[PDB]
Design a protein around this ligand. Sequence first.
Ligand SMILES: [Mg+2]
Ligand SMILES: [Mg+2]
Ligand SMILES: [Mg+2]
Ligand SMILES: [Mg+2]
Ligand SMILES: [Mg+2]
Ligand SMILES: [Mg+2]
Ligand SMILES: [Mg+2]
Ligand SMILES: [Mg+2]
Ligand SMILES: [Mg+2]
Ligand SMILES: [Mg+2]
Ligand SMILES: [Mg+2]
Ligand SMILES: [Mg+2]
Ligand SMILES: [Mg+2]
Ligand SMILES: [Mg+2]
Ligand SMILES: [Mg+2]
Ligand SMILES: [Mg+2]
Ligand SMILES: [Mg+2]
Ligand SMILES: [Mg+2]
Ligand SMILES: [Mg+2]
Ligand SMILES: [Mg+2]
Ligand SMILES: [Mg+2]
Ligand SMILES: [Mg+2]
Ligand SMILES: [Mg+2]
Ligand SMILES: [Mg+2]
Ligand SMILES: [Mg+2]
Ligand SMILES: [Mg+2]
Ligand SMILES: [Mg+2]
Ligand SMILES: [Mg+2]
Ligand SMILES: [Mg+2]
Ligand SMILES: [Mg+2]
Ligand SMILES: [Mg+2]
Ligand SMILES: [Mg+2]
Ligand SMILES: [Mg+2]
Ligand SMILES: [Mg+2]
Ligand SMILES: [Mg+2]
Ligand SMILES: [Mg+2]
Ligand SMILES: [Mg+2]
Ligand SMILES: [Mg+2]
Ligand SMILES: [Mg+2]
Ligand SMILES: [Mg+2]
Ligand SMILES: [Mg+2]
Ligand SMILES: [Mg+2]
Ligand SMILES: [Mg+2]
Ligand SMILES: [Mg+2]
Ligand SMILES: [Mg+2]
Ligand SMILES: [Mg+2]
Ligand SMILES: [Mg+2]
Ligand SMILES: [Mg+2]
Ligand SMILES: [Mg+2]
Ligand SMILES: [Mg+2]
Ligand SMILES: [Mg+2]
Ligand SMILES: [Mg+2]
Ligand SMILES: [Mg+2]
Ligand SMILES: [Mg+2]
Ligand SMILES: [Mg+2]
Ligand SMILES: [Mg+2]
Ligand SMILES: [Mg+2]
Ligand SMILES: [Mg+2]
Ligand SMILES: [Mg+2]
Ligand SMILES: [Mg+2]
Ligand SMILES: [Mg+2]
Ligand SMILES: [Mg+2]
Ligand SMILES: [Mg+2]
Ligand SMILES: [Mg+2]
Ligand SMILES: [Mg+2]
Ligand SMILES: [Mg+2]
Ligand SMILES: [Mg+2]
Ligand SMILES: [Mg+2]
Ligand SMILES: [Mg+2]
Ligand SMILES: [Mg+2]
Ligand SMILES: [Mg+2]
Ligand SMILES: [Mg+2]
Ligand SMILES: [Mg+2]
Ligand SMILES: [Mg+2]
Ligand SMILES: [Mg+2]
Ligand SMILES: [Mg+2]
Ligand SMILES: [Mg+2]
Ligand SMILES: [Mg+2]
Ligand SMILES: [Mg+2]
Ligand SMILES: [Mg+2]
Ligand SMILES: [Mg+2]
Ligand SMILES: [Mg+2]
Ligand SMILES: [Mg+2]
Length: 63
Amino acid sequence: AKSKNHTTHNQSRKWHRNGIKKPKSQRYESLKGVDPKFMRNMRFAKKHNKKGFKKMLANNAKN
RNA sequence: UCUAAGGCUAAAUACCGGCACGAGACCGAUAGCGGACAAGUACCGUAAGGGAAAGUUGAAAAGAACUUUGAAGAGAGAGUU
RNA sequence: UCUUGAAACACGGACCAAGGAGUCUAACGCGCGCGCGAGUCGGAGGGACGCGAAACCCUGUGGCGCAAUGAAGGUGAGGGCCGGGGCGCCCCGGCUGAGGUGGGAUCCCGCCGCGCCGGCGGGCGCACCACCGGCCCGUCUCGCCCGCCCCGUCGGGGAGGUGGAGCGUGAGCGCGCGCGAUAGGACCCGAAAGAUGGUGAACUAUGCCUGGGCAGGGCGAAGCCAGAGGAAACUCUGGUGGAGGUCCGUAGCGGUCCUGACGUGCAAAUCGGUCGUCCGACCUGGGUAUAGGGGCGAAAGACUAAUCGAACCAUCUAGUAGCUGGUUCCCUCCGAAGUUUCCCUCAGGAUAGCUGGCGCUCGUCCGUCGCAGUUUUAUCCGGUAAAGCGAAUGAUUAGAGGUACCUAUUCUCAAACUUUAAAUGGGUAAGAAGCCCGGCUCGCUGGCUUGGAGCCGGGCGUGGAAUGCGAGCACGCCUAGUGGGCCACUUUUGGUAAGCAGAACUGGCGCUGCGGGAUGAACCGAACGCCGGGUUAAGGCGCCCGAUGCCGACGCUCAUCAGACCCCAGAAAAGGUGUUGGUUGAUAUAGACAGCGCCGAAUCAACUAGCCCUGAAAAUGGAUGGCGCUGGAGCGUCGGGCCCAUACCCGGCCGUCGCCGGCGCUGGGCUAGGCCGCGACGAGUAGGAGGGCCGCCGCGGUGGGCGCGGAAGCCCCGGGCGAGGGCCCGGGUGGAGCCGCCGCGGGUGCAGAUCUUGGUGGUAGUAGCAAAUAUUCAAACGAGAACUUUGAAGGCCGAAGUGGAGAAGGGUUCCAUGUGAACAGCAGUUGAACAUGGGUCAGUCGGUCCUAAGAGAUGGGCGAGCGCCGUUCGGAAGGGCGGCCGAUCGAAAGGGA
RNA sequence: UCCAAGGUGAACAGCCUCUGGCAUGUUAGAACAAUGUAGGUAAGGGAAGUCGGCAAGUCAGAUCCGUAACUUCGGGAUAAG
RNA sequence: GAAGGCCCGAGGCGGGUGUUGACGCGAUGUGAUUUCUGCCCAGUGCUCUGAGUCAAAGUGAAGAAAUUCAAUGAAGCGCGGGUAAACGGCAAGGUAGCCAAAUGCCUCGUCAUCUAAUUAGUGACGCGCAUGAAUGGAUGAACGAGAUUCCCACUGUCCCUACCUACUAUCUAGCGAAACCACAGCCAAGGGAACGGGCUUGGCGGAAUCAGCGGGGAAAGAAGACCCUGUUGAGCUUGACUCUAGUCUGCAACUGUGAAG
RNA sequence: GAGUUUGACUGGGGCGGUACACCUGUCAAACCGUAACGCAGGUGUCCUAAGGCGAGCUCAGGGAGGACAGAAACCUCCCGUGGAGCAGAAGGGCAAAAGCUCGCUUGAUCUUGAUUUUCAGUAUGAAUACAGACCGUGAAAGCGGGGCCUCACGAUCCUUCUGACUUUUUGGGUUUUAAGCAGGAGGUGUCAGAAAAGUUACCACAGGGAUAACUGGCUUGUGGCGGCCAAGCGUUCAUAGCGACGUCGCUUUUUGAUCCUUCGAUGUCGGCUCUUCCUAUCAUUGUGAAGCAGAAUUCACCAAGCGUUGGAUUGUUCACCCACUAAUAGGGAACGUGAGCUGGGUUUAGACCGUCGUGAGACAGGUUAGUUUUACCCUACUGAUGAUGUGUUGUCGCAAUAGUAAUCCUGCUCAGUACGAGAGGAACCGCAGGUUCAGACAUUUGGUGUAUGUGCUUGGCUGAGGAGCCAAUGGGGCGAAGCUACCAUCUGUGGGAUUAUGACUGAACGCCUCUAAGUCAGAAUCCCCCCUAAACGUGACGAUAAGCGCCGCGGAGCCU
Ligand SMILES: [Mg+2]
Ligand SMILES: [Mg+2]
Ligand SMILES: [Mg+2]
Ligand SMILES: [Mg+2]
Ligand SMILES: [Mg+2]
Ligand SMILES: [Mg+2]
Ligand SMILES: [Mg+2]
Ligand SMILES: [Mg+2]
Ligand SMILES: [Mg+2]
Ligand SMILES: [Mg+2]
Ligand SMILES: [Mg+2]
Ligand SMILES: [Mg+2]
Ligand SMILES: [Mg+2]
Ligand SMILES: [Mg+2]
Ligand SMILES: [Mg+2]
Ligand SMILES: [Mg+2]
Ligand SMILES: [Mg+2]
Ligand SMILES: [Mg+2]
Ligand SMILES: [Mg+2]
Ligand SMILES: [Mg+2]
Ligand SMILES: [Mg+2]
Ligand SMILES: [Mg+2]
Ligand SMILES: [Mg+2]
Ligand SMILES: [Mg+2]
Ligand SMILES: [Mg+2]
Ligand SMILES: [Mg+2]
Ligand SMILES: [Mg+2]
Ligand SMILES: [Mg+2]
Ligand SMILES: [Mg+2]
Ligand SMILES: [Mg+2]
Ligand SMILES: [Mg+2]
Ligand SMILES: [Mg+2]
Ligand SMILES: [Mg+2]
Ligand SMILES: [Mg+2]
Ligand SMILES: [Mg+2]
Ligand SMILES: [Mg+2]
Ligand SMILES: [Mg+2]
Ligand SMILES: [Mg+2]
Ligand SMILES: [Mg+2]
Ligand SMILES: [Mg+2]
Ligand SMILES: [Mg+2]
Ligand SMILES: [Mg+2]
Ligand SMILES: [Mg+2]
Ligand SMILES: [Mg+2]
Ligand SMILES: [Mg+2]
Ligand SMILES: [Mg+2]
Ligand SMILES: [Mg+2]
Ligand SMILES: [Mg+2]
Ligand SMILES: [Mg+2]
Ligand SMILES: [Mg+2]
Ligand SMILES: [Mg+2]
Ligand SMILES: [Mg+2]
Ligand SMILES: [Mg+2]
Ligand SMILES: [Mg+2]
Ligand SMILES: [Mg+2]
Ligand SMILES: [Mg+2]
Ligand SMILES: [Mg+2]
Ligand SMILES: [Mg+2]
Ligand SMILES: [Mg+2]
Ligand SMILES: [Mg+2]
Ligand SMILES: [Mg+2]
Ligand SMILES: [Mg+2]
Ligand SMILES: [Mg+2]
Ligand SMILES: [Mg+2]
Ligand SMILES: [Mg+2]
Ligand SMILES: [Mg+2]
Ligand SMILES: [Mg+2]
Ligand SMILES: [Mg+2]
Ligand SMILES: [Mg+2]
Ligand SMILES: [Mg+2]
Ligand SMILES: [Mg+2]
Ligand SMILES: [Mg+2]
Ligand SMILES: [Mg+2]
Ligand SMILES: [Mg+2]
Ligand SMILES: [Mg+2]
Ligand SMILES: [Mg+2]
Ligand SMILES: [Mg+2]
Ligand SMILES: [Mg+2]
Ligand SMILES: [Mg+2]
Ligand SMILES: [Mg+2]
Ligand SMILES: [Mg+2]
Ligand SMILES: [Mg+2]
Ligand SMILES: [Mg+2]
């Protein structure tokens, strides 16, 4: 009472039945798996980014 | 915190059996109880047990006198409604 | 119906009627509707007071939410702006109450083009999403501050990672509807089994008790008698006797062979002939004993009531079933899978995929986002085909040269070889998430703004390839079915091969009809609402059979097995001086070829290619589909015309779907859940969803409904309506109830289930009414005589009877009269039928009495207990000085006046 | 289970009859085909049939004779003829 | 040898054998007589001895105790002996016998006999696939509804059928079922689920029926007993898993009195 | 004694194998992926270094050399792209490396999260890149948290160990104990992980044509059969008859392969019986060829009309043998044929023996005994009524079509002839019979015989005789009629076109030629006659009832 072992015959039709969908490209992709030492300093760059907010307003006025 | 190795004690509670009632968005004679009827009857098995089928003339029997064919069932008229 | 495949020589279905299969309760999830809403619900109970067991009111105990997290001790969720100060990296004050980036329906404003309408310029940005902070709990690393009456092994906080079903201005709760997965009998029907309790030894197996029965003959044992022989011991002969798991054989009991008869029988084991045994381990009745995992067995798993390799009965029990079978109205729309992973899985599930439903977030003139089974451009990837081995590895042929090697060549190869190397194919990119200019943050990086990344401001569309197209929400949420596939081109593995087995890719079949191939699940064409006209595809156009009934074109071919077109349904090697082409050569008018120098013009050889032919043998008679066709109806090359598919074009109608559709501004109109307009579209199994003014039963409403002037039901060569489910009307029949509309509750729709119950067919006036010799004549009664009765004749049983009486069993069958309806398988004047009466007389026949094997109380013992064990074993004498030793039951064949 | 006539014969065998009983066994008439079931015969050959002398047939009573191999001395034995 | 063997039994001062007592009862094997009954005690099993493992209870030790440790340490196992008319084999290597057998694969063995002809039969031969001695070997009169070979006799078994009789069938009067049945019923070929009756192309096809018949309907009769599957069973068996009645053994209790070592 | 278990995959199942958890090369068709009990292999380990780092060094092999010393000992030089080695299978990688050697070592340590691969994108296993510690090494840059890379491994529960702490040990406190958190290990190889021996023929149930045994279907390896080529055989001569080395086919009477149909069942081996079919012809008919003188035989052609037998053994098909014969050819039809038979084999349950298993049991080893059911239904076939439309009815005929039938041999004669040296030894016509078959038939012979015909006779009965009866036909002798037997007897048949083949004329092709056009002979084959049947076919002819037939275009009308 043997049967069939492996088949990929009708699988291409099933895959394209709803179409092969790529993940929607999102701005600001996820930062998972990045260097932890790099992520530490990048958090500190955003943590103290408001410290130079007064210099930003002064330099924008020169333009 | 209680005082075992002694006892008693109603109510609220349970009830498919029985007795007597009320009811139904239930079943309507192959349904509802097996059983609407001489149903746990007929019938079967040595026995323990198994277990049916089967309700309806019309309002009122007024259920067809009488005549005639046939031995008779069974018919033809007549008659009741 | 299962299936890859069914008209199947696969299964179910003779026929009709009624019944007949997805339910209900609990709990869960999602969607939807309703109420209230950081709440929400009385679902216990209490109180008002026919239908009222309702409804009304109160009660928030409690449940579920509002807080999470850790194993636990436990602890436990506020962001931002402004100013000052500290300059590390986090103090103070104030104003507020969830931040920042990108996107964002809607709203707001400016300007322009026309207080309306379009351009691009900004803003507040919902929900949601991507990302980055922040906070709470667990845990880890690095740590230097702080708090106190219970200063300690005390309790607090920081910084940076990380775990969590968190917080980040709640969304739940109650109720109802639907679907999905469950547990319950669980869609219906079905096991082989298992368990508890009980009933059977009238069959049979065996022991016991008490009875009964078993012709006629054969051989003829021990004992005995007599006569003989012998010197004796002892022997011999005749007769007698009547022994035995002896022989022939009847009854009886068995059951060999015919593998006979029968085999829907006389019979759920019989009949005939034949056969075994028939004084014995013989046969048999009755009374007793042993009871189901037990009994009993001269042993066959035999037998234990037609049941035995574990009886029967009822219950547990609607036992379970990954396995078969069946699973009931119509329509509209969408529409599969036999594949992935895991599984004591491989007839099955879980999971992913494919499916459907429900939506939701947006877009919806150009424009811009966004999208793609496709090209283009740019740039990468690979090691297959082919090639190579005078290159590596491996294999391999032949010579040559120099001195078996060695050099230079040469032949042939690789799938597990390769220097090379495609075609097809895979990945990425083709901008605003960009470019450009100027700054800011950092604790990372460091010779040095040096990097890097993040952030801020400003400026710049020619959107920065072609084409098509609406997208997004981890392609959201729930989700059925499927998880046996099969076939074809190409590629490809095993196999001699296979209508074989196993893969890749795409299409197809399955799920699919249609035209064509005669025919046929897959091939060719083309996919499907209902029609009209037209035109085609593939394929055809002698006739069957629509179309060449053209003065079609050119050749090829004769077949005493001609040939006749994808898949495709019989041919090969090798041959032909059949015929027709072509190729390469060779002789010849200084005269060849062939034939006897004559002859006088071409000839010969090899090879190749078409058609035909040989090669070519199978069994029922037969297959270009058939007829038949040979100036073609054959083969090849083509032309014009013609034939028709559910395909294409145009038109009508129906439905679905889509319109940033239209209409509240009324002769008609607007049941807005309506009406109207436009465009496209239409296959379907399993499956899903919606609609039904389809149908059935019952309820609350409602129609001042219907009905003896005729309801329901039923019948109809009556009239109709609807695409259909169905419905209305008319007639006939019927005789008392019935129906429409809005809601509500289901035991709601049948052709199947070797369905259930009931009824009826063909078979069919058929099988049959055939075991045991046999009836006939006359008469009588009578409507009626092959069957009754009487008489006569002829026969049978032939005293181990077809005779005369009992036992067990039957229970009025006995007897008389009467009936002829049903029964007595023909008939019947007859009956063991039916109806009405009658009939069984005991001291001395049996029961009754006795105990036989047995059974069974008392004492006693056991046992949870109903009870069981036990038949002497205890103060056991109810009589007339007593012995008894075991009450009682147990024989209609024992005992017994 | 009980009673059990005559003839034939060794016989309660088979066959015939008497006493007694019965009407041919849940039907009849006609016909006499095949094929059956049951019964019987068959010339000549005699198991050539067939898995196989299956079935059938031969033999049979009694009387007078005659009776081996073998043997457990009993038998074989109704040997056989 | 009865305080027993064997067995029943839920249970007792229970019950059977047993109204018994070794010439008995119980459990097995072989299977009259005659004739023999060989070898192996390793394995398994039974049985018989007194020198590692060994439960509970009891004793000792440590510890606050629970607990732990130690010593002691039954039966059984292990060790040892016997046993094969125990299972078995031939630790022993098949002895006496027997045979191509009811036992021989090769095989229709070889030889003789039996017939014209013999895979049969018989007598022999035996390195016997795979005979063999109470898992009994060999023989054997009588006996056998046992298997087998031949001969005589006999016969319709046959060559080779025929005829006769009885009851049926058949016909009639009366009476009157059942299995079965999707629809049904003439074929060839083709295709097809690869053996059509129906479809395709042909052959062709004429009411209603009787008696026969056994080709067909892959005829009927029965949800194949063969084969496989099922995480379906049952009967039986063991060196299967897990238990158990029974039985053996140990401890304290019922269990008292006294002496001695 | 009770309960339960006794894996799965699988070209049925079992046995075998593990394709059951993994790895390499290939298959695999140039991304990845991709199956089979596809191919060639590996794995349940090994390593305190064979881990880590640094430094130096260069291998396999070859040439030339150098006491013993040689084809291989060691020393030296030169060449040497790795042709060595790197623990193992294979692939890849690797040269002042990853190899070899040496000296310092324990990054094979303590942690958080992310990622890759198998993937459902779960787990495990094994990997990748960081980060925070603590270290090793090197002068340092760096490198290292196992092995150069691709394999070398394991959930819950439970036990055990280590570590940590405001962790619990339940009204508090202390100490034991127990529990918990976190990280290891003890293992499930059926490797995402039950706790597991059989037997069943005494078997049971659910099913399955998803799946075996029997037919058919595809295939033809094998079997059978037949070509082609021509080495050679045939004294010589390849092809009279043969055919090596090769090679191309056919057949479905072998077997195998496959598993498509059937497991709510297609009765299954042989024989018997019986019909038809095939030819790959054994015999007969007509021919061609020879290593054909005759005879016998061999090869080949047209050809299946006709025939292919009787027996011993065996269940057997198949073989073997005895004879006979013209020959004793080969097969199909569901391996034709079981509601046709027969049960011998096989193929339930009983039983024996051998081998096997401890056992129950098994054995395609042997042996013995073992129920063979139903037709009356539909077609088919066999016969029997009848139906058909021309008025009824009858006689006498025609005839489509269908069936079809004869066959083989012997003796005599030719003829001791032809032929041959002989030995031997035919043929045509003719003649006499026979075999098998067919259709008849009973005069004769045989058989049956219930004319129950006539005798004989047994038992019984009728009083006896006489005459008879009964015994399922009492028995027996003979026997009419009838029926019946190669067991008696009779009869069995003519042509036509042609096949094979041999020829004529005669081209193609000045010749030749059976052929191309045209002609001839020509057969057991074929067709037909003869013969049997007689159609929804029919001709001639007779007789045809107050009814009825002809004749008045009867003369007018009604239905179809
Ligand atoms: Mg599968
Ligand atoms: Mg597999
Ligand atoms: Mg009550
Ligand atoms: Mg009722
Ligand atoms: Mg078929
Ligand atoms: Mg079925
Ligand atoms: Mg049926
Ligand atoms: Mg109904
Ligand atoms: Mg925003
Ligand atoms: Mg059980
Ligand atoms: Mg005798
Ligand atoms: Mg007798
Ligand atoms: Mg009998
Ligand atoms: Mg019989
Ligand atoms: Mg019969
Ligand atoms: Mg006898
Ligand atoms: Mg008795
Ligand atoms: Mg019981
Ligand atoms: Mg048995
Ligand atoms: Mg549709
Ligand atoms: Mg699919
Ligand atoms: Mg199935
Ligand atoms: Mg699904
Ligand atoms: Mg699933
Ligand atoms: Mg399936
Ligand atoms: Mg395939
Ligand atoms: Mg297959
Ligand atoms: Mg399907
Ligand atoms: Mg489709
Ligand atoms: Mg075709
Ligand atoms: Mg049209
Ligand atoms: Mg056509
Ligand atoms: Mg040739
Ligand atoms: Mg040809
Ligand atoms: Mg249109
Ligand atoms: Mg109802
Ligand atoms: Mg219902
Ligand atoms: Mg119905
Ligand atoms: Mg009476
Ligand atoms: Mg009376
Ligand atoms: Mg009657
Ligand atoms: Mg009565
Ligand atoms: Mg008494
Ligand atoms: Mg008495
Ligand atoms: Mg009679
Ligand atoms: Mg004779
Ligand atoms: Mg014979
Ligand atoms: Mg006999
Ligand atoms: Mg004798
Ligand atoms: Mg013994
Ligand atoms: Mg021993
Ligand atoms: Mg010997
Ligand atoms: Mg013989
Ligand atoms: Mg012998
Ligand atoms: Mg011995
Ligand atoms: Mg006997
Ligand atoms: Mg059919
Ligand atoms: Mg059948
Ligand atoms: Mg079945
Ligand atoms: Mg399974
Ligand atoms: Mg059983
Ligand atoms: Mg079991
Ligand atoms: Mg299996
Ligand atoms: Mg690849
Ligand atoms: Mg580190
Ligand atoms: Mg199949
Ligand atoms: Mg071959
Ligand atoms: Mg050859
Ligand atoms: Mg031929
Ligand atoms: Mg014979
Ligand atoms: Mg056959
Ligand atoms: Mg048949
Ligand atoms: Mg049969
Ligand atoms: Mg047969
Ligand atoms: Mg047999
Ligand atoms: Mg048997
Ligand atoms: Mg001469
Ligand atoms: Mg007399
Ligand atoms: Mg008599
Ligand atoms: Mg007689
Ligand atoms: Mg005579
Ligand atoms: Mg000719
Ligand atoms: Mg001629």
